[PDB]
Coordinates of C-alpha atoms (C1' of nucleotides) in Angstrom, one line a residue:
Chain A
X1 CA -80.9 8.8 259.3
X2 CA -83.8 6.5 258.7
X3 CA -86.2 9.1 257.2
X4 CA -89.7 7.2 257.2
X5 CA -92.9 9.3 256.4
X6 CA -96.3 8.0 255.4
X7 CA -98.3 8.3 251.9
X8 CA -101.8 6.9 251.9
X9 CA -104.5 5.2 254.8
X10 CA -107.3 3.5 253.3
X11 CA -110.3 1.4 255.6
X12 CA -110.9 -1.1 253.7
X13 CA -113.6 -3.7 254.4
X14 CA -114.6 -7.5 254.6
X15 CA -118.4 -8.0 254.7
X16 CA -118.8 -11.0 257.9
X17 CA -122.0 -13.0 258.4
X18 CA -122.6 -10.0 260.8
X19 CA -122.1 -6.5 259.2
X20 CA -119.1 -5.5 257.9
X21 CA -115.8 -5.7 259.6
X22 CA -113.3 -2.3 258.9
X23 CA -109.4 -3.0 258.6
X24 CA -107.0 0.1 257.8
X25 CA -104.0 -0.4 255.5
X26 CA -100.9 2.1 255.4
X27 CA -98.4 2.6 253.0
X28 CA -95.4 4.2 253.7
X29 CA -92.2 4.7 252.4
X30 CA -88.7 4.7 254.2
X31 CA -85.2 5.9 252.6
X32 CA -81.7 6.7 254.5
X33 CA -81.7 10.3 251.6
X34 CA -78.7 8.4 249.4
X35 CA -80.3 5.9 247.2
X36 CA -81.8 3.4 249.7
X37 CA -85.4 3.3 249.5
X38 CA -88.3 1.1 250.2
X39 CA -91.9 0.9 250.7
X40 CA -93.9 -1.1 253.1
X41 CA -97.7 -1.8 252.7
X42 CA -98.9 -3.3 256.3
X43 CA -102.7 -3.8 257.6
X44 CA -104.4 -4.1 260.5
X45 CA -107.3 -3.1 262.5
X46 CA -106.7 0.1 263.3
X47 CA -104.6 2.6 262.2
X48 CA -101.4 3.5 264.8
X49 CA -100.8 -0.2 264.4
X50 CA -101.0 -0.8 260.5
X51 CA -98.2 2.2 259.9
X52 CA -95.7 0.4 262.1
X53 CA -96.2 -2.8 260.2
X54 CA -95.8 -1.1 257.2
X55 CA -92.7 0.9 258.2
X56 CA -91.5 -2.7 259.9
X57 CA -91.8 -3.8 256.2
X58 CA -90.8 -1.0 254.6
X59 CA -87.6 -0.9 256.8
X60 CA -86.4 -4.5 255.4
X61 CA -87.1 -5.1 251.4
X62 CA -85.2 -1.8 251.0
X63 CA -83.4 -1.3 247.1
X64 CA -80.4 0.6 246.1
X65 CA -80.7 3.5 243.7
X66 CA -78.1 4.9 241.5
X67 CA -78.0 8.4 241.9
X68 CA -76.3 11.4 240.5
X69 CA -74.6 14.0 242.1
X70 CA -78.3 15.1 243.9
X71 CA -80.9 13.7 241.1
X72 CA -81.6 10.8 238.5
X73 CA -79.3 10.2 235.3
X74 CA -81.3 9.7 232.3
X75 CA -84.7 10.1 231.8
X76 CA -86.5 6.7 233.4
X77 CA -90.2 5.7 232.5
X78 CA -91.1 2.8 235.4
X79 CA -94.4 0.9 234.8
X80 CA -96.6 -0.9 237.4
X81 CA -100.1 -2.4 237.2
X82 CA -102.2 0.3 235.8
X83 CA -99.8 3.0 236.4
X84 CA -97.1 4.4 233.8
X85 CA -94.4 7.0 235.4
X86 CA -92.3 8.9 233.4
X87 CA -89.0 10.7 235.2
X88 CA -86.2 13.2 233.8
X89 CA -82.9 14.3 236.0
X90 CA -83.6 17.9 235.6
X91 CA -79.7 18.8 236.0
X92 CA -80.5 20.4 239.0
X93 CA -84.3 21.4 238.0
X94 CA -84.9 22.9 241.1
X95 CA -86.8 20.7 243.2
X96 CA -88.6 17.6 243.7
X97 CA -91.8 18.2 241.0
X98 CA -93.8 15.0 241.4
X99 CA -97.1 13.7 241.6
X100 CA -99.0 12.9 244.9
X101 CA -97.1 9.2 246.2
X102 CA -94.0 9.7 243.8
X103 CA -93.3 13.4 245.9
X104 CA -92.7 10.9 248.9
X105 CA -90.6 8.8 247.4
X106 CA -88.6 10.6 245.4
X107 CA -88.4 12.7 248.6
X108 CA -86.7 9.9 250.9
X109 CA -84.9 8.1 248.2
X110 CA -82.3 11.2 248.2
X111 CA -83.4 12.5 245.1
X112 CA -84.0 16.5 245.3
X113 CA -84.9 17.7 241.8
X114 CA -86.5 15.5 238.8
X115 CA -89.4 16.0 236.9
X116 CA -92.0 13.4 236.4
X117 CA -95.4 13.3 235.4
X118 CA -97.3 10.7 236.4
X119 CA -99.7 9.0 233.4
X120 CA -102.3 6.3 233.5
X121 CA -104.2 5.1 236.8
X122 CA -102.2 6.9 239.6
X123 CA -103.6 4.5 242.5
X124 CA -100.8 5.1 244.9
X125 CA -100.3 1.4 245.9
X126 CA -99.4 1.3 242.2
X127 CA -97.3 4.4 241.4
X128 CA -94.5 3.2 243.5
X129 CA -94.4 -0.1 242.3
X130 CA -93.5 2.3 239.3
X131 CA -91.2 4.9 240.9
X132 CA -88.8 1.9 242.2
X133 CA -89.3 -0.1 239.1
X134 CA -88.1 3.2 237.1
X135 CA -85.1 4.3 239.9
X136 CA -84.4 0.7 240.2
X137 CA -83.6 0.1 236.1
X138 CA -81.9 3.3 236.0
X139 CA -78.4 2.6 235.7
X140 CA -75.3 4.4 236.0
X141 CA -72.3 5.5 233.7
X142 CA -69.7 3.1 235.6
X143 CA -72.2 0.3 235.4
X144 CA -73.0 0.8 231.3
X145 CA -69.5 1.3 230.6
X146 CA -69.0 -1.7 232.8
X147 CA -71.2 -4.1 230.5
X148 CA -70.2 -2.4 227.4
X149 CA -66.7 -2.9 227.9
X150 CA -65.7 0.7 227.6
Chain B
rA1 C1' -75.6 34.4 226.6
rA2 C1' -80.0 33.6 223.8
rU3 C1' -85.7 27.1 225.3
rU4 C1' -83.5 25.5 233.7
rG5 C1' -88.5 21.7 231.3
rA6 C1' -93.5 18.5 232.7
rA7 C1' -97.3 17.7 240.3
rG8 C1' -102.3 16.1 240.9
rA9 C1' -107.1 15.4 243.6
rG10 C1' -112.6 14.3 244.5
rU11 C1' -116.6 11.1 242.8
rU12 C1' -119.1 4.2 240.4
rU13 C1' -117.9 -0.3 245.2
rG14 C1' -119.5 -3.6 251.3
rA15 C1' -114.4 -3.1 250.0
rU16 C1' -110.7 -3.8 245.5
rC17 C1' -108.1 -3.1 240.9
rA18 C1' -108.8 -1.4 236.1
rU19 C1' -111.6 1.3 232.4
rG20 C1' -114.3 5.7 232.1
rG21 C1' -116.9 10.2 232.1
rC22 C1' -118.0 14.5 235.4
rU23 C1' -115.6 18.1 238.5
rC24 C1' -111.9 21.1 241.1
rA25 C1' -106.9 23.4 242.2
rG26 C1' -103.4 27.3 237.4
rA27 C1' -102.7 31.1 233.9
rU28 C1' -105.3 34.6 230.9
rU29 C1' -109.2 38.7 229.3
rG30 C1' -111.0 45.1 225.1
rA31 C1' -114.4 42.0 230.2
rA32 C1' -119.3 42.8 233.1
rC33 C1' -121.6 42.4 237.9
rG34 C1' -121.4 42.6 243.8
rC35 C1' -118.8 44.7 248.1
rU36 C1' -115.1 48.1 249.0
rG37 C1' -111.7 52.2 247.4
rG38 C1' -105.7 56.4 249.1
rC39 C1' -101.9 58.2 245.6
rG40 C1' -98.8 57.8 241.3
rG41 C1' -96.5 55.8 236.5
rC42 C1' -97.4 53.3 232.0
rA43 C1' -101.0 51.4 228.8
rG44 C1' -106.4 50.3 227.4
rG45 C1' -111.6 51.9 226.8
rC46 C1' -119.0 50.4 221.6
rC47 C1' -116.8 43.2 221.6
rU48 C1' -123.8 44.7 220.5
rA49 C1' -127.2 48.0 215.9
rA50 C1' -122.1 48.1 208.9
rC51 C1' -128.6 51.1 213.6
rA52 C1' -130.5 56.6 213.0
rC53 C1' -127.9 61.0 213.6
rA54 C1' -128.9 67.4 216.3
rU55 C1' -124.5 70.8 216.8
rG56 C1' -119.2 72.2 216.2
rC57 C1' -114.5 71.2 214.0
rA58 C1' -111.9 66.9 210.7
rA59 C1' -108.4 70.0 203.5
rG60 C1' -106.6 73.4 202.3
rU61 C1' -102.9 76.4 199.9
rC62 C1' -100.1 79.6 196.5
rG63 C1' -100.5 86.8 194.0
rA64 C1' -93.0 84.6 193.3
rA65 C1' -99.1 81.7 187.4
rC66 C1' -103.3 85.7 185.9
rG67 C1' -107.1 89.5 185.2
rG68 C1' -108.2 92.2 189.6
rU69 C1' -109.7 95.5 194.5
rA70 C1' -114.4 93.3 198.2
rA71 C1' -112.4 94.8 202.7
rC72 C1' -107.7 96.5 206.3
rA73 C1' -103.5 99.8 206.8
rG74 C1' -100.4 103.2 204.3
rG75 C1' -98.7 106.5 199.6
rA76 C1' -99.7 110.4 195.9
rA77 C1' -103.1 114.4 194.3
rG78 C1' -107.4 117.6 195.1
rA79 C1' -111.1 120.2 198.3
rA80 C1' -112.9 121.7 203.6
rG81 C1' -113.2 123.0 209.3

RNA sequence: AAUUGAAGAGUUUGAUCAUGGCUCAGAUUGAACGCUGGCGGCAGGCCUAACACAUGCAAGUCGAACGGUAACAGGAAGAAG
C-alpha cells in the first residue's frame, strides 16, 4: 500500500581538477492512492542507489491531499519556479490526463481523472513542486465551510 | 437529453535553472507520388490554361389560334388488268 514509482534520472556532473566526476539524481514520487503523497529527490553516484535515497526521502515529507469522491474539487492552478500547472476535477473525466511528471503524481496521490495542462517550463524537478503546491492549497467543502462559518 | 473538457518530448551547458527559437508525436484533405491490391455499400472526381476546340446530343411545343397538304394511312368518285 506504499505505491512508489520513479519519474526522472538525470547524470549530472561536477568538473574536479581531474576530468569530470558523474553523479545520478532520481526523483521519485510515493503515495498510499488516498491523498498521501510526496516526492523525494536523492543523489548519488550511481543510479540503484540514488532511487532508494530518494524514495527514503520521498517516504517521510509525505502531505495530505483533500480529495473528492475519486478526483480534485475545484479547479487548482499550483505554481513552482518556472513551472505554472493548471488542474480541473473532471467529475469523473475519465482518467488521469496529465503531462509527463504530473501523470506520476497525480497517479499515486489517488487521484484517477483530472485534467491539467501543464504551462511554462515543465522541468520535472519543478512541475511537482507545482502539482503539491496546487493539491496541497486545494481545499475541501467541510474545511471552507469550516472557516466561513457556514 | 441536447458542449464528459485541456498530456507532452528532443535539442544551447562540463553540469544547472530560466528565457528562447527549431523539431517531433495528433487530426484533416477535391490530394499527388512509391510499393501493394479481394469484394461490397455510400459519397467524391480539371484545384492548373476564364487555353483552343473535331464530332454527337444539351429547347422545344401547340392544328382545341390560322391559311394549308410536303409526306404516311384511310374515305368518296372515276378509269383499267
Amino acid at each position: 500500500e506504499l505505491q512508489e514509482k520513479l519519474i526522472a534520472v538525470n547524470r549530472v556532473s561536477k568538473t574536479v581538477k581531474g576530468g569530470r566526476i558523474f553523479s545520478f539524481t532520481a526523483l521519485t514520487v510515493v503515495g498510499d492512492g488516498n491523498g498521501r503523497v510526496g516526492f523525494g529527490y536523492g543523489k548519488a553516484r550511481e543510479v540503484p542507489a540514488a532511487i532508494q535515497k530518494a524514495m527514503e526521502k520521498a517516504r517521510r515529507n509525505m502531505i495530505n491531499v483533500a480529495l473528492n469522491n475519486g478526483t480534485l474539487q475545484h479547479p487548482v492552478k499550483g505554481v513552482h519556479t518556472g513551472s505554472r500547472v493548471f488542474m480541473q476535477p473532471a467529475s469523473e473525466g475519465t482518467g488521469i490526463i496529465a503531462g509527463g511528471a504530473m501523470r506520476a503524481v497525480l497517479e499515486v496521490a489517488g487521484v484517477h481523472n483530472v485534467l491539467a495542462k501543464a504551462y511554462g517550463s515543465t522541468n520535472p524537478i519543478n512541475v511537482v513542486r507545482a502539482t503539491i503546491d496546487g493539491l496541497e492549497n486545494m481545499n475541501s467543502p467541510e474545511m471552507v465551510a469550516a472557516k466561513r462559518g457556514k
